[PDB]
Structures are given as structure tokens and as C-alpha cells.
Design a protein around this nucleic acid. Structure first.
Lengths: 689, 91, 178, 98, 98
RNA sequence: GCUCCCGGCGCUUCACAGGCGCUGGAAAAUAUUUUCCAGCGUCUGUCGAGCGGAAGGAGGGA
């Protein structure tokens, strides 16, 4: 009979385990996983008040995405008496100096932000690892390969061992991809990436207490027939798009930057043409997948996108290309509308005519989806229903949103119960179907869904991770599940009691999707049992395996000041430097990466580079480097490119273009380096340049 | 209906008979990289059968199957509606 | 190989070069990627700006003794304006030899040269069409290239006066005040 | 697709399937229209020569305090007379007047 | 004839500090079956514990400090009326008496 | 606008493993069967590398 939440037995046990030895906590997504984080944050607050110069320490809460960082910062601000800071790339952190970072850390006890911000924070000696009492990693399953989490963990192998912080990993799922087989080595590698083992709830009472906030929703399958025959209008539109592609291949826009493949063997089309081709191919996919009405909505979306691009275009040739694209989109829309209108001979009642044409001009997938939506929310209370619809493609979100708007304002029973809404990830799509230059609507889709204004969300893998969403009774995975983490986290989204989890799969893939779900469940069971039976007294990986984990990549470079140049950050730093050098809007040129041929590689490197790849980088004309820095002979092209960028950054630092912190020198440092020799007489008058 | 290894059988029927070994030719590679359709041709003395497949693998296999059973022969306007009796099958 | 219509440019500019690499540096925009033997024109234009400003100021100080110093500094600012340098560069058809690879810059230069031809290469009122700083910067760059090649401020002054004679004569009769 | 409950008013003993529609569909019978619309859903119609029924739709509102003023076009509203085959519609035992 | 479960009503009314955090999203957790809704009269121990835990966790999520009264007042019989309406109904009683 | 990162899917080209199909050589048994080896082609799976679309994330910069 109280409001304040008390820590549970399992949370206390996890905190006590974490305080003596670092590790990873693996708990279902919800309030427990953040409460345990807050508790371990509170336990390491002994030296919060004392400043760093007096032996003080801080706590670091490093997240994966900016929205999750803001979310956790607000949570810890409202749940603890500490003052927390928010540090993301939107704050302009790059141009932050020594003193105003120093007072910043002096001000806030807990620092919350994205991984890259804290990575550049540490690598530029703004703080030391000895200055952090505890570091908090949430969504630790992202820390694989060259992710910023793994680079931050790599930073631990360089600093002092006796003054390292405490590492804590929060996750709801351990495996990121489909490497479900052989769980043991994957879990061992994840534990080696951090400096502790995975701990989870063990006692039956502990599991029951955890069950009070997590849920295992019932998962059901909705079979729909799969057909291959296609309409004639689809063939006509495909022929039109092919003809337009042929015409656009010789559009002859102004000279464009050369685009190549990821490894630089094969050439690419210009990005401006690739955008149009991608949009039209996506529209074709949606037309083939969801139906003619879906194509009618998607062509309006394409109209809006092309109109926006034409408005933002700067060159007349680009505007002409976008005008041709808009002409094609208008022709396609007119054809689709003509096809839709040749059914009105059935009846005159338009309210049922809209539903009938929608159900007649959509593939069985969409028809079955709409029937399930109707039978699930027939005449219920809008305040009582709160569901998410998961689809793969970004434009599928908008297309289904428009189709759902029409269907809702087409059926009497669903008219006042469902309010659809949609959102996509980065490179956001215009949420308007009319291409208006400006709209007065300001409430974001996620904010509307949180506030209860909208009860029907159509999202594309964005809401699977990070963002907190209130418990949803229904979750519709319209597109087939692809990854184990996606399945686990979407299943965990339906966190309310008796919640329903819905899978939409065609008839021909029923066996394969059932087998995939069975492998996912068996992977979950092996994870549970491996965390169950395994016992270790040391409970921490040894130094030798931690060293062996990171020795595969290139050894980082540190100077006498302690700043560390990570080879994985070398390309980013180099592109950052090439950005500040130009003194004009049109002066931007990125370094030219060139892969040496066999004869050139032999002639340059002797007989010591057979079977290996080398990359030569040509710095722009303005910069001091004109020596065509050659990468070391590496196994593949990516390592060669990284080595080339690393050597370029090192030679730039030796030339003084990096201000002994591997961040490009600004104008202020350049004039400060010259004040004492050219403006020495200013000192006697109490002024400095 | 191609239950087995059609091209193993093809080589079998060819070079039991002292016939020349089956030659394979990759004629065309058409389509986008994510939807490339490959064309393998098979020639055995004066007979030549065509093979289309999404990969050179299945294209060659089907070409050889055509060669194989040819060696034996010669010694809508509307999306279909869905019923409303669907149910949520447990998994 | 980089320098095409070499005689055309030398004849229009009024100077013959003994070492052509200064000209290459003058005509090399930073966006031009295939020039790997000599830097851009920013170095050259930095010196050329001061050289041209000093020479113009010296001439107006020597000859224009009738007008008050306020009019003298107004005339100085008008003669070295980037717009005036752009009109002078276009009038002598020096934009044909700019080594650049930017589409937007090329379109801007083409629009400006079309507008200038519409006015018959006459300096209009401080020009609705944007003026690219590239023309003025490259003109200053070739000025500094002449100075460095000849090592004679008198020959450089002869070149600058030959380029500026119409603008000098017109601006000495009326002062553009804005 | 309209699963809302409705009220049956009279049953037509003299009427039977395969009978011509009285308005605008003289060439179209109830039986063949029902097949052409929902054959894949119903399969076939059994008891083909028995009676049929006439149904009327019920209002979906629940608040009747304010007057529902509008141009209903009462003749046009009554134009869509609905005649249904009995065994194809699920029948409650609940009285309609209640 | 129907109301909220007896146990949740008792918790809601007999705890003013706990009544300001129950919201519509918390009420979705109260999905009782036929037995609870018909014979038992109140939610089971597991459902009650889960609902209480969700309401407590409301204070740490983004819902902290929110005002759910506008959507949950009718459940407990509370209602909000402007003071102008109160003055006007006093005057209306005076007027009818006059 | 650019760069980077993570995962999944589809094809291409190399290495390894096994099977199949036979030709030839060696051996055993009664033209026939079996054993060993070499060659060619394939079928199944695994490790590398590349190409392409699709999803998510971050940063610098205007």
C-alpha cells in the first residue's frame, strides 16, 4: 500500500554481484532492466561530489541512439537526486574546448549520451578512465565488430589497469544476428568484449518476481494464400518504368562526383540518379507485394518526395530530371486511378464502395490483414486498444498508413476506434501526402502514440529497439521476421497481460517460418540453460584472452599527452579535416581513394605484397599532403583503407595539422601559436590577440 | 519433378556410350545484381538444350535435366478473394 | 597538356609567361582533382589581392588629387570590389581557362557570363544574379602570377592598367556610392 | 463483410431463390447474384426452393437525446430493400422488438 | 449492474496517494476472464500484483506527473465541473423556485 | 550532402569436406562382381572474397 517502488530481491542480488565484480545483466525489457541500472548507478556514487582534481569520480551512461540517451537521462534525472547531463552530436560537441568540458564534468555527476560522443571524449583526453567510477552500457548486444561500444571497450586495453571503471551491460537480447547455433562461443565472445560474465535471474521466486513486469504474450499465426499472377496494369507500369530508366541513363546532368562500390572494384551511377532508381524500384516492389490501392498511395508518396527533391534542387538539369520523374509518377498515378475507377458499376453507396474496392484491389496479404484488424478491434474502446504494426520497408509504413486511413474512414465499425500513425528511422520520410511547403502539425508520431491520441502504429523496426512504448495488447508483424533479436524484442513489445502476438506468413512459407520460430525458441532455451548450469569461480575473463580478442586489428597510436588515435576512427578524422580546410562552398573535395593494380603493387612493394591488397590515397590539392600515402599490404580492401587513413592521420599529426589531440586545428589555436612571436608587445598593455 | 542429380545422370548416359562428355556454356547473364538470371547451355554431339535459372547452379542443373530426358524421348484482372473463416493458429 | 588555347589566354591577358606553372596555379580551382603538380589559386590570390589593391591605391593617390579622401577611398573600394573583378574577368574571357569540376559553380559562371553579355560586358549597378567569387579570385591569382613571373612591379602595373583602363576611366568621372 | 446484426421484418413464402430482382436487376436472380458475389465463400446454396426473408438494418448510435436533422431522402433510404436467403444468414433466437 | 473489480476499487478509493497514478494504459492490464468477471467479482492475485506493479512503475517512466483523471474519472465516479456551471445551476434553482 | 558502423537476404568467384556418375590403371573372385588409385563432371555442406537491394544507428558539416 505505497507508491514508491522498492528494489526486489533479484535486483538487489544483481546489484551486489555487480558492485564486487563487473559483468553483463540479461533481463527482459521493461522497468526492471532500468531500475537495476539506476540502483548500480546509485551504488557507485561515493565520489560524485568531490572534484576530479581532489580524487573525485563520475558515472557514464552511454547509449546507442540519441532518443534512448535522452530517455535514460530523463529517467535517471527524475528517479535520482543527481544532476545528469545530455551530450549528443546535436549539441555541437565537436567544437568544445578544454575549459568548458572541464566545467561541464564539474557540474554534472552523471553523463548521458551517445557512444561516439563519449568515445571522442575519452580519446581526446577530456577525461580519463580513472575519472569514471562506473560506466553503463545499455543494449550491449550492439558492441560487436567495429561498433563504438567495442571501440570504447578497446580503449580499456590501453589505459591503466588498476584504475579502470566498472563496466555494466544492460540488454534484453544477447545475440544480434542469426548466429543462433553454437550459443556458447558467441556468449563467451560477448563476455570477452566487456570485462565480465553474464548474470541472470536463477531462483523460481526471482523468476516469478521478474514476471510481474515482463510478459510472454500468446503468439499466433495468420495464414493467407500466396498467388503469383499479376495484373496487366502492373506490366504496363513496369514497361513505363523500364523505358524511363533507359531515358534517364542518358539524362546528362552536370558533372557529378564519382561513385564506386564499397570495396572500389565496380563503378556506381551518380547518387542523384540512384535515388530516383531506388524510389521507383521500391514503388514496384510495393505494387507487386500489397496491391493496386497500395500502389495508388505509394505513387502519391513518390510524387511528394520528387516534388520536395525538385524544390531542393540547385541545378537546372537536376530540376529537369525531377520534372521528368514527376511526369512519370503522375502518369502512373493516373493509370492506377483509372484501373481503380473501373469497378463503380457495382453500386452507388460510396462508403461500402471504398471498402469493396480496397478489398478487391489488394493482395490476399492485405485483405487478411484488414480482416484481422476488423475482427480484433470491431467495436472496442479506442482508449483500450494500443497496437503496433511492424513492416520491413520504410515506404511500406507510409503506404500502409494511407491505406489504413482510407479503410478506417470506409467502415462504420472501425471509424471511431483506430487512429493510425507511422514513423521510420533516419532519413525520415515526409509524413504529408499533399507536398505542402509547411504544415502546422507539430506533435511527433511517437509522442501522439504515447499520449494516446493515436492507437495504431505502423513502424519499420524503429520501435523494436530503444524507445519506451507503453504496453501493447496487439503486435502485428505484417512482414516476415528476419532476425532473432527482432523476433525477441517485438515479442517483448507486447508486454501487457494476455497480449496477442500476430504473425502474417503466406501458405508456401508456413513450414519455413515455423522452423525459424522453433530455432529462435530453441536458441532462447540454450541461452537460458547455458547461463543456468555454467559455474565459474573467477567470474571474469583473464587478461590473455582479452588481449587476444583485440590484437587482430591494427594497434592504435598514442602520443606523450595520452591522446589515442583509433585506426577505426582515422577515416572519420581525416574526412573531418578535409571538411575544415576548404574556404568556399564549392571547395569541398573528399580524398580520392585508389586501389593499386597488380603491376603497380609489385613495382612499388617488391615481392613482399603478393596475395595482399594495398590502397593509395590522394589528398586534395589544397592540403599539404601530396605524397600519395600508401597503405600497408593487408589481407582485404577494408583493412587497407583503414591503414591508409591511419597513416594519413599520423603524417598529418606529424605535420602539426592535428592539435596533439588528433582533432583538426582550428583558427584560434593557429593564431595562439603565433601570438607570442608576432604580438609580443600586446602583453604590456594587458591585452592578447 | 527433378528429384536427384540430373547432370550426374546426364554425364552417365553420355559417357557410357563412348559419347563425348557434356560441354557446358554460360551464354548470358541478365537482370539486376539482386535478380540476375543466368543462362547455361549444354552441348552433346549435335544436341543442345537450354537452361534458365536464377543462378548458374540451378540453370546448369535444369539445362542438364532437359538434355537428360531429351536423350530418353529421342534415342486475371482480379486478386482472388479470401474467406472469412480464418483463425489464429497457435505456434 | 593542362593549358589549352594557351596563346588565346596570353593574348587576352596581355602578358607572355616564361614559366607557365604560375599560370597553372592561378587557374587551378581547389575543386579540380586531376592537378597533382601545383596547388590551388588561394595562395596566389592571397598575394595578388594585396598587390592589386596597393597598385590601384598608388595610382589613384598619384593621379586623383582633386577629389577628397572620402571619395578616394570609395573609389578604391569600388575598383577592388569582387564584382568589378568579376566583370573584368568575364570581359577578357578569362573564365574559359578556369580549371574546376563543380557543377553548381559552372552553372553560376555560365549564368553570370550570359548576364554580362546581355549588358555588353559593361559594369552595371554593382552587378539580381549571384556573382561567383571564383572569377575575382582567379583574376587576382593571374595578377600575382604575372608579378611572380616577371619580378617587376612596373610590368605588373602595365598589365593591371591594361585590364582596368575602362573601369579606371569610368570610375574616375563618377564615384559609385551605395 | 458487413457482420453487423440486423432485424428481419417479414419472410416471403411466395418468394424463392432464382427469382428475378424486382428493380434494376430483372436479368439477375438472387441465386446467381449470390454465387457471382460470394461463391468461393459459400460454395453452394441448399434448400433452393424454400422461402426467403427480408431484413432491415439497425442504427449504430446509442445516444438519442439530440435530433438527427438531415436530408435523409427517405424514399432513397428505403430504396435499398434487402432480401436474404435464410440459411446463408446466421439466426439468433433473440426477438427483434426486444 | 456492473463496475470495476472490488479489490482494485478498494485500493483506488482507500489510497489517495496511489489514485493519481492509475491511467488508461494501466487499466489495459485488467483483462479478466469469464470466471473473474462473473462469479469471483475481482481480479486474481497475479493480475492484481501485475496491475499494482505497473501503476508503481508509472512513476519512473515518461508517464510520471501526468494527469490521467480526464480519462479514468468515470471509473470511480469522480467528475470535474467548472465553477461557472456551479454558480449557474445555483441561479437556475433560484430561477425555477421564483 | 558526405563518411562510418551493425545485422539480415539474394547472386558471383575461390579453398575444404563428403556423396554420386563413369573412364582408365592395379588387385581379388566367377563376359560378370568386388577392392584400391588417378582423372573429369556434378550433388550436399563449410570457410574466404566480391556484387546488389532492403532495415537500423551515429557523427562531422551548412
Amino acid at each position: 500500500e505505497d507508491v514508491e517502488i522498492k528494489p526486489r530481491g533479484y535486483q538487489l542480488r544483481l546489484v551486489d554481484h555487480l558492485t564486487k565484480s563487473n559483468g553483463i545483466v540479461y533481463l527482459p525489457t521493461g522497468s526492471g532492466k532500468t531500475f537495476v541500472a539506476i540502483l548500480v548507478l546509485k551504488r557507485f556514487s561515493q565520489d560524485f561530489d568531490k572534484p576530479i582534481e581532489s580524487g573525485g569520480k563520475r558515472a557514464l551512461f552511454m547509449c546507442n541512439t540519441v532518443e534512448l540517451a535522452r530517455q535514460q537521462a530523463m529517467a535517471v534525472r527524475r528517479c535520482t537526486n543527481f544532476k545528469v547531463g545530455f551530450y549528443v552530436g546535436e549539441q555541437g560537441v565537436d567544437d568544445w574546448t578544454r575549459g568548458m568540458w572541464s566545467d561541464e564534468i564539474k557540474k554534472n555527476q552523471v553523463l548521458v549520451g551517445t557512444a561516439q560522443v563519449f568515445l571522442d571524449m575519452v580519446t581526446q583526453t577530456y577525461v580519463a578512465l580513472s575519472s569514471l567510477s562506473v560506466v553503463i552500457i545499455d543494449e550491449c548486444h550492439h558492441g560487436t565488430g567495429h561498433h563504438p561500444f567495442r571501440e570504447f571497450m578497446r580503449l580499456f586495453t590501453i589505459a591503466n589497469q588498476t584504475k579502470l571503471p566498472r563496466v555494466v551491460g544492460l540488454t534484453g537480447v544477447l545475440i544480434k544476428g542469426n548466429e543462433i547455433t553454437n550459443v556458447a562461443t558467441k556468449l563467451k565472445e560477448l563476455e570477452i568484449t566487456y570485462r565480465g560474465n553474464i548474470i541472470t535471474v536463477s531462483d523460481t521466486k526471482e523468476m516469478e518476481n521478474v514476471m510481474l513486469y515482463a510478459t510472454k504474450p500468446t503468439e499466433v499465426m495468420v495464414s493467407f494464400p500466396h498467388q503469383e499472377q499479376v495484373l496487366t496494369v502492373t506490366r504496363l507500369i513496369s514497361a513505363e518504368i523500364e523505358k524511363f530508366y533507359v531515358s534517364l541513363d542518358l539524362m546528362n546532368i552536370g558533372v557529378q562526383p564519382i561513385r564506386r562500390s564499397k570495396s572500389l572494384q565496380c563503378l556506381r551511377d551518380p547518387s542523384k540518379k540512384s535515388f530516383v532508381k531506388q524510389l521507383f524500384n521500391d514503388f514496384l516492389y510495393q505494387m507487386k507485394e500489397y496491391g493496386i490501392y497500395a500502389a495508388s498511395i505509394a505513387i502519391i508518396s513518390l510524387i511528394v518526395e520528387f516534388d520536395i527533391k525538385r524544390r531542393q534542387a540547385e541545378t537546372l538539369s537536376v530540376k529537369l530530371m525531377h520534372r521528368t520523374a514527376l511526369t512519370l509518377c503522375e502518369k502512373i498515378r493516373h493509370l492506377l486511378v483509372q484501373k481503380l475507377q473501373d469497378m463503380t458499376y457495382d453500386d452507388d453507396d460510396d462508403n461500402v464502395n471504398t471498402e469493396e474496392v480496397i478489398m478487391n484491389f489488394s493482395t490476399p496479404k492485405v485483405q487478411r490483414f484488414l480482416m484481422s484488424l476488423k475482427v480484433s478491434f470491431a467495436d472496442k474502446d479506442p482508449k483500450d486498444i494500443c497496437c503496433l504494426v511492424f513492416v520491413e520497408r520504410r515506404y511500406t509504413c507510409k503506404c500502409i498508413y494511407g491505406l489504413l486511413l482510407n479503410y478506417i474512414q470506409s467502415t462504420p465499425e472501425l471509424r471511431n476506434v483506430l487512429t493510425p500513425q507511422f514513423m521510420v528511422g533516419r532519413n525520415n520520410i515526409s509524413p504529408d501526402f499533399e507536398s505542402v511547403l509547411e504544415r502546422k502539425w507539430q506533435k511527433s508520431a511517437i509522442q501522439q502514440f504515447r499520449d494516446g491520441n493515436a492507437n495504431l502504429m505502423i513502424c519499420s523496426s524503429v520501435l523494436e529497439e530503444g524507445i519506451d512504448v507503453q504496453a501493447c495488447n496487439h503486435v502485428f508483424i505484417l512482414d516476415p521476421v528476419k532476425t532473432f533479436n527482432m523476433y525477441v524484442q517485438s515479442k517483448g513489445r507486447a508486454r501487457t497481460t494476455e497480449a496477442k502476438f500476430v504473425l502474417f506468413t503466406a501458405d508456401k512459407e508456413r513450414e519455413k517460418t515455423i522452423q525459424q520460430i522453433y530455432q529462435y525458441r530453441k536458441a532462447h532455451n540454450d541461452i537460458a540453460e547455458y547461463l543456468k548450469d555454467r559455474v565459474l569461480e573467477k567470474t571474469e575473463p583473464e587478461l590473455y584472452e582479452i588481449k587476444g580478442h583485440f590484437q587482430d586489428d591494427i594497434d592504435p597510436f598514442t602520443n606523450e599527452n595520452g591522446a589515442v588515435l583509433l585506426p577505426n576512427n582515422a577515416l572519420a578524422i581525416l574526412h573531418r579535416y578535409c571538411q575544415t580546410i576548404p574556404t568556399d562552398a564549392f571547395g569541398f573535395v573528399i580524398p580520392w581513394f585508389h586501389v593499386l593494380q597488380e603491376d603497380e603493387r609489385d613495382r612499388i612493394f617488391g615481392v613482399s605484397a603478393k596475395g595482399k591488397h594495398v590502397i593509395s590515397i590522394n589528398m586534395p590539392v589544397n592540403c599539404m599532403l601530396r605524397d600519395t600515402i600508401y597503405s600497408d599490404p593487408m589481407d582485404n580492401v577494408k583493412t587497407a583503407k583503414i591503414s591508409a587513413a591511419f597513416k594519413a592521420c599520423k603524417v598529418l599529426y606529424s605535420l602539426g595539422e592535428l592539435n596533439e589531440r588528433f582533432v583538426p586545428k582550428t583558427l584560434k589555436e593557429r593564431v595562439a601559436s603565433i601570438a607570442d612571436v608576432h604580438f609580443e608587445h600586446w602583453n604590456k598593455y594587458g591585452d592578447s590577440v | 519433378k527433378t528429384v536427384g542429380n540430373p547432370i550426374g545422370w546426364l554425364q552417365e548416359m553420355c559417357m557410357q556410350r563412348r559419347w563425348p562428355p557434356p560441354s557446358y556454356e554460360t551464354e548470358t547473364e541478365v537482370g539486376l545484381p539482386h535478380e540476375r538470371l543466368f543462362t547455361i547451355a549444354c552441348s552433346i554431339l549435335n544436341y543442345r538444350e537450354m537452361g534458365k535459372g536464377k543462378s548458374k547452379k540451378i540453370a546448369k542443373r535444369l539445362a542438364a535435366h532437359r538434355m537428360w530426358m531429351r536423350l530418353q524421348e529421342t534415342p486475371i484482372d482480379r486478386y482472388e478473394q479470401v474467406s472469412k473463416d480464418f483463425e489464429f493458429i497457435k505456434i | 597538356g593542362f593549358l589549352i588555347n594557351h596563346y588565346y589566354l596570353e593574348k587576352n591577358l596581355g602578358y607572355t609567361f616564361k614559366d607557365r606553372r604560375y599560370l597553372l596555379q592561378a587557374l587551378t580551382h581547389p575543386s579540380y582533382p586531376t592537378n597533382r603538380i601545383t596547388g590551388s589559386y588561394q595562395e596566389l590570390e592571397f598575394i595578388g589581392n594585396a598587390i592589386l589593391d596597393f597598385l590601384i591605391s598608388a595610382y589613384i593617390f598619384e593621379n586623383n588629387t582633386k577629389m577628397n579622401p572620402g571619395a578616394l577611398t570609395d573609389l578604391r573600394s569600388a575598383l577592388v570590389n569582387n564584382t568589378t573583378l568579376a566583370c573584368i574577368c568575364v570581359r577578357h574571357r578569362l573564365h574559359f581557362f578556369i580549371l574546376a569540376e563543380n557543377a553548381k559553380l559552372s552553372e553560376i559562371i555560365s549564368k553570370f557570363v550570359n548576364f554580362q553579355e546581355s549588358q555588353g560586358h559593361r559594369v552595371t549597378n554593382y552587378v539580381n544574379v549571384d556573382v561567383p567569387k571564383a572569377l575575382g579570385d582567379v583574376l587576382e591569382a593571374l595578377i600575382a602570377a604575372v608579378y611572380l613571373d616577371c619580378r617587376d612591379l612596373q610590368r605588373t602595373w602595365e598589365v593591371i592598367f591594361n585590364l582596368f583602363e575602362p573601369e579606371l576611366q569610368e570610375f574616375t568621372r563618377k564615384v559609385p556610392i551605395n | 463483410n458487413y457482420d453487423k446484426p440486423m432485424l428481419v421484418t417479414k419472410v416471403h413464402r411466395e418468394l424463392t431463390p432464382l427469382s428475378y430482382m424486382e428493380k434494376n436487376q430483372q436479368d439477375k436472380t438472387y441465386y446467381e447474384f449470390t454465387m457471382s458475389k460470394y461463391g468461393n465463400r459459400i460454395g453452394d446454396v441448399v434448400h433452393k426452393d424454400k422461402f426467403m426473408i427480408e431484413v432491415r438494418d439497425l442504427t449504430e448510435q446509442l445516444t438519442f437525446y439530440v435530433h438527427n436533422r438531415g436530408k435523409f431522402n427517405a424514399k432513397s433510404k428505403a430504396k435499398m430493400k434487402v432480401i436474404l436467403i435464410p440459411e446463408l444468414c446466421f439466426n439468433f433466437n433473440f426477438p427483434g422488438d426486444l | 449492474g456492473i463496475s470495476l473489480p472490488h479489490n482494485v476499487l478498494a485500493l483506488w478509493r482507500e489510497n489517495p496517494e496511489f489514485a493519481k497514478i492509475i491511467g488508461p494504459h494501466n487499466l489495459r492490464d485488467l483483462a479478466l476472464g469469464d470466471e473473474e468477471s462473473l462469479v469471483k467479482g475481482n481480479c486474481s492475485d497475479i493480475n492484481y500484483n501485475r496491475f499494482v506493479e505497473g501503476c508503481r512503475a508509472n512513476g519512473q517512466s515518461f508517464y510520471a506527473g501526468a494527469d490521467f483523471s480526464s480519462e479514468v474519472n468515470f471509473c470511480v465516479g469522480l467528475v470535474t465541473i467548472p465553477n461557472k456551471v456551479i454558480a449557474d445551476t445555483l441561479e437556475a434553482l433560484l430561477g425555477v423556485i421564483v
